[PDB]
Structure 1
């Protein structure tokens, strides 16, 4: 649903692999396209309007070149739906569209209105809403990537010893979009992947990450989330629930537990220092 070049820039995995927040990374990307033999004019055109001779054999070209470059995992097993003359979608396009409709940042009335639009879009009689949701998703992905670049270049990610710590700040690019737990958690996951692929320091490449973001400055509140260590074969089990609870109680923190996942909580801003000290000393 957009150009080949946009997909390569905005996919989390390739963006991390080629380091495309740095200008040298763009040169590496051009070397990749040159190996495939795709003209740059074709790559900048929309996928629907590309030359049919290239479209028919694209997946083999990309997998072969990716394998040579050391990207061993470019294919996935999935499903797709087709109806009418020209409506076709992969199973993931529906997910990003629905998710974007539901977690939309604009205060267009109460949050239930966003939920209502997300639910309605899952029926075939309401197809125009699906096409609207895709446009919201495109903006969401772009905002995520420029945020990650700003975070790394400004050097906000800091080691505290047993964990990596990072925090966003008001007015900087697109912070409103990351106020909710869903978008915030997914952003933080992409950030950790980018950091571990970037750094050479072995002691940095096996750590969990704790991220904090502004919730309400008029309430003096911040949202806090913790991620398990990043490895390919990890069981996805994480321990930050009981860690946050024990640290908060030992600190007597002013905090609230609200979301259904136990890894995300709300904190008063003034308590964050002693709460972090308690976490550092507890994880030891």
Structure 2
């Protein structure tokens, strides 16, 4: 059931109790965890925090901790499955679920005692009515009703997508409690920007949520500040920006930013040998010297920078890149620390999905979670360096795929596969980084190919995962049209193929459109996918 008021029916309940946070491995989950940690630390709520990277380790952690905790909070996990069946809880536990995944499972919706959904009722939700889903001529009509149930429930469960950011939900809770600090607002901004960077939401919804956050930014910017009374440089200042879509461009050279941003790399076709001359034509049209463009942005001459954003937009419009600007936010504090929300997103994401083998994925979660606090600015800057490396590896992998023509149109969907031992495959073995790679590669492919047919197809990408057990990670991506609503069917198409072929499919990641598959079964799995999508 949906929690109507977060303050009354969730926070004031768990405020008196020991609580267990299960937190998923993504930047929005991390930001929601930071906000909720801050509230609990204000109120001396003795919580325990456990990272979980998948369903099986969530089940393991719950089996470990179910004896000692009666109140659980799941951040960016649980809403899209039957948690009662998955975890098999005791009759009197409570699971609060703050999760962006949609559609919410009908058992989660209509469970009225144990599952409590911290989900805004005004999200994109169309739940079927209870009587349509739950309980001679009489039994004939019973069977007819069951057939109608199967039809309706397939129509409900078909398309998976994402709702409002969990960080924004927790910030609204903090605002209702009136314990909303400026760093909490920054964490909310970073969660929404994580959704936008990973393309989990439409541009319309992102602009609407930015419009929501602008008012909170104005309120915080007038708590103790106006045009004639101003604070120390120590204090944090969040500012609304109509900034550039380039990635990390204030922390490395504008050349590296243009080369390693997905949009401009795809448009200029910089994987190709000819694309560098297109980029040089763009820079010459702007009138920026190449030495300045290749110099680091902080060391670039200041006479080039104070109208650079509108210069970029003006040149991009006549080059056909009609939307180089983006509505975003920045944070300043001290004399020299300045970050865009995209910069913090990429740094934290890289700290999570780092290619380092030392430690473990939970240690990398811990590094990412530490980097979001300003007591660990060294960790944030290290994450920025790792993000530069990750972006470069992404472009090299895209270039390899397109140059070798690994992307082949398998009728209903394009298909690509990474190969074991090839460069950076270990970096992209992790499902989140693989999803980002597949999205960037699909944009690059759509800009590359001249066929009108290929510009509309979705894409399925495979990569090696295991040799001790011999498996691969497979992801499904929707088409990259500007008309797209950012919903995909691959979460259900994969399991329909898997059950049609009786394939050894394992379903550990929280997104249904990412799976693990035995390397032998991929042939018949793909055959079933072509047969299914038709």
Structure 2-normalised TM-score? 0.52
Q: What per-residue deviation string (whole Å, max 9, x for no partner) do you get for residues 84-131 of structure 1?
A: 111111111111011111111212222211111111111111211111
Distance 2:466 2:321 in 1: 41
Residue 51 in 1 paired to residue 284 in 2?
Answer: no
Q: What per-residue deviation string (whole Å, max 9, x for no partner) do you get for residues 37-79 of structure 1?
A: 1111111111111111111121121111111111110111111
Distance 2:501 2:468 in 1: 23
SS where residue 232 of structure 1 aligns? coil
Distance 1:145 1:175 in 2: 13
Note the residue ranges of structure 1 that are not aligned, 5 or more in a row.
Answer: none
Distance 2:284 2:497 in 1: 53
Distance 1:209 1:53 in 2: 44
Distance 1:70 1:282 in 2: 37
Q: What per-residue deviation string (whole Å, max 9, x for no partner) do you get for residues 141-179 of structure 1?
A: 000001100101111111111111111111111100111
Distance 1:65 1:29 in 2: 12
Distance 1:29 1:187 in 2: 22
Structure 1-normalised TM-score? 0.98
Superposition deviation, residue 81 in structure 1: 0.8
SS where residue 426 of structure 2 aligns? helix
Superposition deviation, residue 258 in structure 1: 0.7
Matched residue, 1:265: 515
Aligned length: 284
Superposition deviation, residue 233 in structure 1: 2.3
Matched residue, 2:340: 90
SS where residue 79 of structure 1 aligns? strand
Note the residue ranges of structure 2 that are not aligned, 5 or more in a row.
Answer: 1-250
Q: Which deviates further from its counterpart, 181-190 or 124-133? A: 124-133
Superposition deviation, residue 211 in structure 1: 0.8
SS where residue 325 of structure 2 aligns? coil
SS where residue 77 of structure 1 aligns? strand
**Rg: which structure is higher?**
2
Distance 1:195 1:7 in 2: 20
SS where residue 193 of structure 1 aligns? helix
SS where residue 520 of structure 2 aligns? helix
Distance 1:229 1:52 in 2: 41
Residue 242 in 1 paired to residue 478 in 2?
Answer: no
Distance 1:141 1:194 in 2: 14
Q: Which deviates further from its counterpart, 40-49 or 140-149? A: 40-49
Q: What per-residue deviation string (whole Å, max 9, x for no partner) do you get for residues 210-264 of structure 1?
A: 1111011231111111111121121111111111111111101112111111101
Distance 2:271 2:361 in 1: 34
SS where residue 270 of structure 1 aligns? coil
Distance 1:58 1:233 in 2: 29
Superposition deviation, residue 207 in structure 1: 0.8
SS where residue 8 of structure 1 aligns? helix
Distance 1:230 1:41 in 2: 35
Distance 1:243 1:40 in 2: 48
- Larger helix share, 1 or 2: 1
SS where residue 231 of structure 1 aligns? coil
Q: Which deviates further from its counterpart, 136-145 or 31-40? A: 31-40
Distance 1:167 1:191 in 2: 12
Residue 159 in 1 paired to residue 373 in 2?
Answer: no
Q: Where do residues 164-183 of structure 1 align in structure 2 (5 Å cutoff)? A: 164-183=414-433
Distance 2:302 2:480 in 1: 40
Distance 1:259 1:23 in 2: 37
Matched residue, 1:63: 313
| 1:30 counterpart (258, 263, 280) | 280
Distance 1:28 1:184 in 2: 28
Distance 1:266 1:43 in 2: 43
